[PDB]
Paper text:
Here we describe a solution to this problem that designs tandem repeat proteins with structured loops (9–14 residues) buttressed by extensive hydrogen bonding interactions. Crystal structures are in close agreement with the design models, with the loops structured and buttressed as designed.
From a fundamental design perspective, the crystal structures presented here show that computational protein design has advanced to the point that proteins with multiple ordered long loops can now be designed. Key to this success was the design of dense networks of hydrogen bonding and nonpolar interactions within and between the loops and between the loops and the underlying secondary structural elements.
Residue numbers in the entry:
A (entry chain H): 3 to 214
B (entry chain A): 2 to 205
Write the structure that this text describes.
C-alpha cells in the first residue's frame, strides 16, 4: 500500500527526505489513500508509524506527531490492532515502558491524541493486558520519571473510562499488582500504590456510581 | 427540636447505651415520615449535626454515625445543604480530615463517597470560595504522610465525580497555582504528588 511504503521510506530514508514526509503524506491522503490499509502481517499505518517512533532517531520522532494527526484526521481506526493483537495504545505504553526519556514524553502526547481519536481505554492485547495493567507495570519497574508519567496517564485513562478492575489472562487484577508495588516498592512507589489502593477501595464495588 | 435532630442530640450528649439502638430508632423514625432535612434555629441539618458528632465524638460515636448518614441520605437528605456559614457537608468532611485523627480520616473518606453517590456537588465552594479540590490540596501541602495519600485519592475520587481543577477561590488562587507551591517547597513524596497532578492537568 502506498501509505505503508511511504512510512517505510521515512524510517528507511534520509533525514532530508524526512522534511518532505509530512507533505507527501498529506498529498498521498488527499489523493484518496486509505489510512487503514494493513500489510500482509496486519501492521496498520498507525502501528507502523508508532513502530518507527520506537526504533527511530529523535528527528524521526518529532516528525511522527504530525504524521499521526494526519492519519487520525484522515480517518484511521485508533483501535485496530496488529495480527498479534497489539493496539496502538498498548504499543504506545510499550514505547514508554522501554523507551528513552525523549520517547516517553512523545508517547505521552500521542496517547492523548489516540484517546481524542476514540481509542478504547479498556481494549486489551492477546494476553489480556489492559492499558491500566501495563501502566501499573511501568510504575512498579520503571524509573522515577516513568513512575510519575505512568501515574498521570493512568488517571487520564480512568477519567477516559478505564475500569480499574479488569484482570489479564492469568487473573491478575490491578489491585493485586498495586499490593505488590506497595510491598516491595520505593518510598515513592508505595505512596503511588497507597493512593491508587485507596481510590480503588472506595469505588471498587461500584466504579461509576458517583460519575454524575 | 425535630425528632431526628433530637435523637442525634441524645447520641452525642448521652451514654453509650443510647448509641447501640440508635440506628434502629432512626430507621423507625424515618419510616414514620420524618423529614431528614429539617434544620434547627441555627441552620444545622441532621447531616451537619451528624458530621459535628464525628468531629467531636468518641470512636464509638464515629462508626455509629457513618451508618446513620447512610440512613439519612437514603431517606432523602440533601447532600448539598450547607450551614448558615455556607459550609457544605463535603467541605466540612474535608475539614474533619484536615484536623482529625487517622481514625477520623479513614471514617470521613467513606462518608465522602456516600455523599458523592447521593449526588453531592464536587465543585460547591464555601463562602470564601474554597472548593473541595482546593482544600484537598491544602491537606496535601501541610498534612501528614497519611493525610497526603488519603487527600490525594479523595482528589482523584472528586475528579472522577466531575470536579473542575481550574476553579479558583475568592483570592483568585487556582489549584495549579497551589500545586506549584507544593512542588517548590514540599517533601520528596509531596513533590511527586504535585508533579503527577501537574502532568494530569496539562494533558487534559
Amino acid at each position: 500500500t502506498p501509505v505503508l511504503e511511504l512510512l517505510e521510506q521515512i524510517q528507511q530514508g534520509s533525514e532530508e527526505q524526512q522534511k518532505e514526509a509530512l507533505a507527501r503524506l498529506q498529498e498521498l491522503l488527499e489523493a484518496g489513500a486509505d489510512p487503514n490499509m494493513a500489510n500482509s502481517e496486519g501492521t496498520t499505518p498507525v502501528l507502523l508509524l508508532l513502530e518507527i517512533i520506537q526504533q527511530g532517531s529523535e528527528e524521526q520522532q518529532k516528525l511522527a506527531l504530525a504524521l499521526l494527526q494526519e492519519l487520525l484526521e484522515a480517518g484511521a481506526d485508533p483501535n485496530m490492532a496488529n495480527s498479534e493483537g497489539t493496539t496502538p495504545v498498548l504499543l504506545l505504553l510499550e514505547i514508554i515502558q522501554q523507551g528513552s526519556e525523549e520517547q516517553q514524553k512523545l508517547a505521552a502526547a500521542l496517547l492523548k491524541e489516540l484517546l481524542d481519536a476514540g481509542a478504547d481505554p479498556n481494549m486489551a492485547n492477546s494476553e489480556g493486558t489492559t492499558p491500566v495493567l501495563l501502566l501499573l507495570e511501568i510504575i512498579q519497574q520503571g524509573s522515577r520519571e516513568q513512575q510519575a508519567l505512568a501515574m498521570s496517564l493512568l488517571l487520564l485513562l480512568l477519567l477516559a473510562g478505564a475500569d480499574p478492575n479488569m484482570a489479564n489472562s492469568e487473573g491478575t487484577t490491578p489491585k493485586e499488582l498495586l499490593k505488590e508495588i506497595q510491598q516491595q516498592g520505593s518510598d515513592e512507589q508505595r505512596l503511588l500504590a497507597e493512593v491508587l489502593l485507596q481510590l480503588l477501595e472506595a469505588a471498587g464495588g461500584s466504579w461509576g456510581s458517583h460519575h454524575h
